[PDB]
Design a protein around this ligand. Structure first.
Ligand SMILES: OC[C@H]1O[C@@](CO)(O[C@H]2O[C@H](CO)[C@@H](O)[C@H](O)[C@H]2O)[C@@H](O)[C@@H]1O
Ligand SMILES: OC[C@H]1O[C@@](CO)(O[C@H]2O[C@H](CO)[C@@H](O)[C@H](O)[C@H]2O)[C@@H](O)[C@@H]1O
Ligand SMILES: OC[C@H]1O[C@@](CO)(O[C@H]2O[C@H](CO)[C@@H](O)[C@H](O)[C@H]2O)[C@@H](O)[C@@H]1O
Ligand SMILES: O=N[O-]
Ligand SMILES: O=N[O-]
Ligand SMILES: O=N[O-]
Ligand SMILES: [Cu+2]
Ligand SMILES: [Cu+2]
Ligand SMILES: [Cu+2]
Ligand SMILES: [Cu+2]
Ligand SMILES: [Cu+2]
Ligand SMILES: [Cu+2]
Lengths: 334, 334, 334
């Protein structure tokens, strides 16, 4: 009865984002996505700690979905019979029925199809929300992601100038609550159900054991470092479904930042550190001016260095000695 | 010596707000309020946990006081002889003498009358502040509320368009610190004085046992759900006197949000989640587009689902299938 | 090879700031600063608790450095042979090499000279960042400060009006993690190295034992209270290198606030409480309207009253009874 063109999207695993246009001359479409729920035991640190994860599409965070204002987003959610619990999905971008949660509850072996219209621009969290105490548990187990709703004319700086990014990365931050046993070692469990009681007691004390980007300590380092070149404008979309974060690009800045993540508001300029409110996504863009390694962290440094929340960028290009120079290398005090 | 008309206001218990005009053609007046302090033992959860509360007017939060810019606010504070401690009041809206705290200290059996001029627009916290370690203790025991200072021309969106609300609710969030005994059960006490030592040890660890709206788990649910109709513009004023909050309307948005709560600043538009800094009030307005149940939470979901911080709205009207529709109900995976 | 005038600055201990111009007709210069690292055991509370501090120039926070946009900042960092650890410096104001950290690592007995161009206006954190788990440890041990980069035309309100301050204070907030022994008393250590293991276990639980301004409970009270007069416009620069803060002037307001601390963005007006994101500095200006004592706190009141985070201002001048008056002094309830 809704007669618009349909467009399928192939989702990609974070931190990458599926191909999309920024400004577009296409009119509204129905954009179709499929998410499949996967419950699974995963390793979250280099010491081999395990965790009962629950995920959209097998990843933490779930994939970024990108559409334009006025599109209709049609999502098929699938809960395979290999899963043990009911799940649903709530989009913060959507209007009514608890963001879709009241219409998408599915047992193992079931699927559902929800359509919502993208009336509000920005980046938005989506997450599972099955009811009661299950809501935080599914979220901190990894069932969250984000959706970016672009203006049809693309991003602007609030003073009439277009802002175009050369690439976009999605960094999903996850607070994790892994109980310890009497000796002080992290416990492992055979099922999410068995993890539940001990995990809930710890959750209610509000202190995470780990805070990670892309699901694991070191996920966005080494071979999997983010990349750019001097002169490239990079958009970083950052979500946190449950707890605040304070992103910071070490050696860089946020040239244009939407910290509340909504493109109806002009961005702030020239930030050192920005703030992502728990239950929200934000976006920052930076044009790289210098080559080398940058670290992207939450600037609670204990969380960054000791609990897992650090990514790297490797940037290629030519060093600018006007911006920064070692005048005198380390030497003995005269 | 100040010769203006006087107007008495009858305060009402939150989440309701006393009757007031938005835009007004009245000039400045002296607006007169009375607050009576009540210390009392209250039940804060459905398991029957008790708490030594200290309150303005018998409620947590204290009532919302509404005036216009340039009014003089004259408050009579009364500390009846049935109370055991000295109290005072500090308004964040007021200028000088620690917001009035240095002029309003009263023992049981005493009253005081303070007048302050409302020179700054917005929503503002008020709270008891008797001195030293007593300050946090009285605040987290429930002695806080808010005052809304409207522009004489009412609210605007910062682009010259009037914003008028059809109704306003006041949601006061309270972090509570209830000690546990050796077995792990919540302790009960005979007086606020006796609760003091154990409560202070726990407070300094910074983790609340409960986080509640309107004084109790479930206070704004069931028969006491907030209400609206499709098409109504509702203002939600949210205060937190001690600890940050991240309000979120599940299934809705903040169409216009003053997250720092001050109407000299234009509102932000189209937010999913906003942030109320500890020691502040903010305000968000939303026009309901869909009927059904909405939940208003802090989007730390552990706090929302497990520690008490969830309210409901029941919205009447007609479902809009253009905004959202279940394309295919839950069914077996083909 | 860079041929500009050189200007030496003599740094002063916080909360004071070295002499500088707001608006200037000078062109770019190379401004030269020297920081000397001092590791030392210090007393942080009135009960005599000690702490293994690590500092720039012997103070917590390190001194505020003030320059103008387009200046080149040339810093000599000195790590004397009396220190035990390597140190470096990272400026959030600077571009490349992890803010300078990758170019400034020095062992005891060494110095280094870094130059960076001040391309972004605002207030910015600087801090030590030696690598890995050392990063949070050096920061929460006291190795942080701030640098203010002014526009050449001085500050403005975003509507074309100049904002000039009559004085500026720098308040550095420090979260400290002091372990307790079995009896429940704070432990003392002989070296930062020996403090490391116990301090790290406590840090990772994320709850500070103390939160202080200027290095010590009560540092900015009594004889060392901040001062102003009625009619004076005072700028307060506030930094927090690791953990969020929510500054509030009790009895006053923030007339003009840059809470993200960056002068490319217009200030917000008329705030009660503002928010400093961990890893950032912000700035607020207020014109005092009333004499007397004001307290400047973080409005987590437990932190303010019980953990150390309270400063005082003593303001001289004439009381304005129009703004506030005690109509009726405390008296028996009729
Ligand atoms: O960046 C958004 C900000 O820019 C303004 C102009 O100052 O409006 C621009 O962006 C709007 C939303 O994308 C466009 O609809 C408008 O046409 C464009 O000028 C502000 O209104 C807005 O807050
Ligand atoms: O919403 C406040 C915001 O709007 C502006 C206009 O952009 O001013 C409007 O609101 C002021 C405060 O209410 C009024 O005094 C003014 O007349 C009206 O245009 C901004 O100045 C202000 O930040
Ligand atoms: O306060 C900064 C804010 O003011 C505006 C004008 O609204 O620009 C002013 O400040 C700029 C940065 O200092 C100046 O370069 C400009 O000349 C001056 O009008 C905004 O553009 C800015 O966000
Ligand atoms: O070893 N169990 O707590
Ligand atoms: O039972 N008292 O801790
Ligand atoms: O007394 N040592 O924990
Ligand atoms: Cu789920
Ligand atoms: Cu949500
Ligand atoms: Cu009191
Ligand atoms: Cu206060
Ligand atoms: Cu160091
Ligand atoms: Cu840093």
């Amino acid at each position: 009865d809704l007669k618009l063109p349909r467009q399928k999207v192939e989702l990609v695993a974070p931190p990458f984002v599926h191909a999309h246009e920024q400004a577009t001359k296409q009119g509204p479409k129905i954009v179709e996505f499929k998410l499949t729920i996967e419950e699974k035991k995963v390793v979250i640190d280099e010491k081999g700690t395990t965790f009962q994860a629950m995920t959209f599409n097998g990843s933490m965070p779930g994939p970024l979905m990108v559409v334009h204002e006025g599109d209709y987003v049609e999502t098929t959610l699938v809960n395979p019979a290999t899963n043990t619990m009911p799940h649903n999905i709530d989009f913060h971008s959507a209007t009514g029925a608890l963001g879709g949660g009241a219409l998408t509850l599915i047992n193992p072996g079931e699927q559902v199809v929800l359509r919502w219209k993208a009336t509000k621009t920005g980046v938005f969290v989506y997450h599972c929300a099955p009811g009661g105490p299950m809501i935080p548990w599914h979220v901190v187990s990894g069932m969250n992601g984000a959706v970016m709703v672009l203006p049809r004319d693309g991003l602007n700086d609030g003073k009439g100038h277009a802002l175009k990014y050369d690439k976009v990365y999605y960094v999903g931050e996850q607070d994790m609550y892994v109980p310890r046993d009497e000796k002080g070692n992290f416990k492992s469990y055979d099922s999410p159900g068995e993890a539940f009681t001990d995990t809930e007691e710890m959750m209610k004390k509000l202190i995470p054991s780990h805070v990670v980007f892309n699901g694991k300590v070191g996920a966005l380092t080494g071979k999997n470092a983010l990349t750019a070149n001097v002169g490239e404008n990079v958009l970083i979309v950052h979500s946190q479904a449950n707890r605040d974060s304070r992103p910071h690009l070490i050696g860089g800045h946020g040239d244009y930042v939407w910290e509340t993540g909504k493109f109806g508001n002009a961005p702030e300029v020239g930030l050192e550190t920005w703030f992502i409110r728990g239950g929200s996504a934000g976006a920052a863009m930076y044009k790289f001016m210098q080559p080398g390694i940058y670290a992207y962290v939450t600037h609670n440094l204990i969380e960054a260095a000791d609990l897992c929340a650090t990514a790297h960028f490797k940037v290629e290009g030519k060093w600018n000695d006007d911006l920064m120079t070692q005048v005198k290398a380390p030497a003995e005090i005269p």
